[PDB]
Ligand binder design. Structure first.
Ligand SMILES: CO[C@H]1/C=C/O[C@@]2(C)OC3=C(C2=O)C2C(O)=C(N4CCOCC4)C(=C(O)C2C(O)=C3C)NC(=O)/C(C)=C\C=C\[C@H](C)[C@H](O)[C@@H](C)[C@@H](O)[C@@H](C)[C@H](OC(=O)COC(=O)CC2=CN(C)C=CC2)[C@@H]1C
Ligand SMILES: CCCCCCCCCC[N+](C)(C)[O-]
Ligand SMILES: [Mg+2]
Ligand code: NA
Length: 707
């Protein structure tokens, strides 16, 4: 019983993000996780970020209390600059600079994460993995849902989800999902707002043809907090021995952040006969973003402010409890088009059944940037001596003062105007030959990644075309009792947008991974358990120039090797459980400035476990009680490994009551509380001047009704 029970467990056994063909998870020679709509509806995650919380190999709350982006550090790696490596419907949501798009989980059918190299099917990519969200689609049966949310910090949400067939044979059906949300962010003076509508339409002329129109529109007046805090006053105590309170805000009173998303496309598939099927995926999007932001830049005594006049103008002991600040003014617009066409050839060679995949992937991205950035001494200073049992106890924090984002002094600030172009075209081939219990996957892909940046201010143009090749091979020995052992080799590549000492675009970095493991996907039991160990290596990483030159040099190499185990299974008819453990060994293997160091923000040990319980007996029938905990190990807060952010464990709880016992079947009411013990933690730090307070205990009531 209960939607998220074995019904989800099993549905989650299938996926395509691993092989670009509908394969059962144990037949995929690579690490992959799946979270369902029922699952997401139970936990009510703020973003896809949380939705993946009980998955191994993923730091998902790195930025802490911020929700602006959906950045994930998978297996200790991320894309250059920390740009999202997020996919939607098999097509990438390409972004640039501060222009990345996000998707509300209320518009998703499910989310999936694939670990390690994946270029063999998607082209240029961060060695570590990629997230792939699936848009909600028109349903077979009717759906009339309205949802109401009320929570802390003045969180108020209201949305709907409607799906129906236009004819009685289902050849014509739609779906319309929309939500309105507004709330105050953890940090004083920050707000969050969002309006999203997803129009979808399906067309099934017959039973071997499907064309579904997928669109999304989202408007966000205010994005929320995305600032930086010094390790001094967060991880470590201030000279006065106190700390900045979790709701502290160091930006202007007039800081502003907005994102605009518009996209249309479709998912198509046609089964010609018994040996041929073809599917194409296309999407076009125009997204915009803007901000007027004052961010922190460490305390005056931080090396980063060695050249700060305002900073030196203070007594040597004050430099340690004064915060330096810089700013930015950004305006961006980008259009992104994508099409992936694939032909599936099903056949065999006597006991050698084949599944030949061959297709072409294409994409182009254009992002126009017009920003302005304040450097040293471009904005005031803040005397962090404001912890006190006042701003902690009483109104945790006092908003700061305004700030002139106009009249940009040529002395302390400057303009930034860039136009980036990106184009990628790849062709791939992959066969899945199963020889009765001996499934073997082997494929390849050739990519054409071409980039071109125009510096409107310098009147300069940097360009580079790359030509790469990646292949993957693996074998799964599917037993018949459940236990499915596997292993595989995999490659990945990622072009560089950086320019070197010579004035050229660095060569692409590459991903090399060896992984072995076993998967338990028994068919007679609603349970699934996995475990794997891997050795993933990225090469030609950009490192400091051997002789300090302001420019970087390639050659750097990093290695990440670890163990991941995931487990999901129904223990009774009312008790479900989910959990995983992650052991990550990330290390600098070749770097001028570092070496033997572990990159920042990546803990060595990671773990999480969750379980729920529903009643089908007494007056407490239909009552669901669930709870879980997420543990984050210690991590370094900078490449230099000069200090360390400590480990933490947050607990979440929910009480759901199946309102069906009042006649309203399919409707229910829930209460969710995050960080129950309202712990206080520093999520992570990317450096000494870039740390983030974790999320402070939240409480949300959710009334969802089905007609
Ligand atoms: C490869 O280096 C990347 C590391 C990422 O990771 C993080 C977590 O680590 C750092 C930062 C990160 O975000 C920094 C950061 O953000 C700073 N500002 C950037 C601009 O806006 C305000 C904040 C920042 C730093 O000093 C930062 C810093 O020291 C560290 C270690 N500003 C300044 O000193 C000031 C006062 C002005 C600079 C102006 C120009 C415009 C920039 O020089 C630009 C040409 C380019 O150099 C960067 C954008 C570069 O980006 C790319 O090359 C690809 O672009 C992206 O992917 C950008 C992007 C970053 N994030 C986190 C999210 C989305 C997009 C970053 C440095
Ligand atoms: C009909 C589906 C195939 C779409 C092919 C898209 C063509 C993109 C142009 C390729 N190239 C970059 C080499 O000019
Ligand atoms: Mg090349
Ligand atoms: Na295989």
């Amino acid at each position: 019983e209960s939607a998220w029970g074995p019904a989800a467990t099993i549905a989650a056994r299938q996926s395509a993000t691993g092989t670009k063909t509908d394969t059962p998870i144990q037949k995929v020679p690579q690490s992959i996780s799946v979270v369902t709509a029922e699952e997401m509806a139970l936990h009510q995650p703020k973003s896809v970020k949380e939705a993946l919380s009980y998955t191994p190999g993923v730091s998902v709350g790195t930025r802490g209390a911020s929700n602006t982006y959906d950045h994930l550090i998978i297996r200790g790696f991320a894309a250059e600059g920390q740009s999202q490596n997020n996919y939607l419907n098999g097509l990438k949501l390409q972004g640039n600079f501060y222009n990345d798009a996000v998707i509300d989980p209320y518009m998703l059918e499910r989310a999936e994460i694939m670990r390690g190299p994946v270029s063999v099917l998607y082209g240029k990519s961060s060695p570590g993995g990629l997230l792939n969200m699936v848009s909600k689609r028109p349903t077979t049966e009717p759906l009339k849902e309205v949802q109401f949310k009320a929570g802390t910090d003045s969180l108020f949400q209201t949305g709907f989800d409607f799906s129906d067939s236009l004819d009685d044979d289902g050849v014509y059906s739609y779906r319309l999902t929309g939500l309105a949300r507004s709330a105050n962010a953890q940090q004083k003076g920050s707000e969050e707002q969002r309006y999203a509508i997803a129009p979808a339409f399906t067309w099934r002329p017959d039973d071997k043809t499907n064309f579904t129109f997928l669109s999304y529109f989202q408007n966000e007046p205010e994005t929320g907090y995305y600032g930086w805090l010094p390790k001094e006053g967060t991880v470590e105590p201030l000279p006065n021995g106190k700390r900045l309170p979790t709701d502290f805000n160091e930006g202007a009173k007039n800081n502003t952040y907005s994102r605009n998303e518009k996209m249309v496309g479709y998912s198509f598939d046609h089964e010609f006969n018994d040996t041929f099927t073809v599917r194409q995926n296309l999407r076009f999007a125009e997204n915009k973003t803007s901000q007027n932001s004052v961010y922190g830049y460490g305390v005056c005594s931080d090396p980063a402010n060695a050249y700060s006049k305002q900073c030196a103008a203070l007594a040597p002991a004050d430099k340690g409890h004064y915060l330096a600040r810089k700013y930015v003014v950004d305006d961006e617009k980008l259009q992104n088009f994508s099409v992936d066409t694939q032909l599936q050839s099903k056949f065999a060679t006597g006991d050698i059944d084949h599944t030949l995949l061959t297709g072409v992937d294409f994409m182009r991205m254009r992002n126009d940037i017009n920003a302005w950035f304040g450097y040293d001494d471009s904005v005031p200073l803040l005397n962090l001596y404001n912890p006190s049992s006042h701003h902690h106890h009483h109104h945790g924090s006092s908003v700061n003062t305004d700030f002139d984002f106009n009249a940009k002094d040529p002395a302390n600030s400057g303009p930034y105007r860039i136009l980036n172009k990106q184009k990628q075209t790849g062709v791939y081939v992959q066969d899945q030959a199963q020889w009765d219990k001996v499934l073997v996957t082997l494929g390849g892909r050739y990519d054409w990644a071409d980039q071109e940046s125009l510096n409107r201010v310098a009147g300069t143009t940097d360009k580079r075309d790359d030509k790469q090749f990646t292949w993957r091979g693996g074998v799964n020995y599917l037993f018949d009792n459940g236990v499915t052992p596997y292993f595989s080799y995999s490659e990945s590549f990622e072009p560089s947008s950086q320019v070197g000492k010579d004035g050229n675009i660095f060569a692409p970095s590459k991903g090399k991974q060896y992984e072995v493991g076993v998967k338990y996907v028994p068919e007679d039991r609603p349970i699934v358990v996995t475990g794997a160990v891997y050795n993933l290596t990225k090469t030609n990483n950009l490192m400091a120039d051997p002789e300090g030159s302001f420019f970087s040099v390639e050659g750097g190499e990093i290695r990440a090797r670890g163990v991941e185990i995931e487990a999901k299974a129904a223990l009774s008819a009312s008790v479900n459980v989910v959990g995983s453990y992650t052991y990550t060994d990330a290390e600098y293997t070749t770097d001028t400035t570092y070496k033997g160091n572990t990159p920042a923000q990546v803990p060595k040990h990671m773990a999480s476990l969750w379980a729920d319980y529903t009643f089908f007996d007494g007056p407490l029938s239909g009552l669901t009680l669930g709870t879980g905990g997420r543990y984050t190990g210690s991590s370094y807060g900078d490449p230099a490994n000069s200090f360390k952010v400590g480990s933490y464990t947050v607990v979440d709880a929910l009480v759901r009551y199946d309102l069906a016992r009042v006649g309203m079947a399919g409707s229910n009411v829930a209460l969710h509380v995050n960080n129950l013990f309202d712990r206080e933690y520093v999520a992570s730090c990317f450096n000494t001047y870039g740390c983030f307070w974790g999320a402070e205990r939240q409480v949300v009531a959710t009334a969802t009704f089905r007609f």
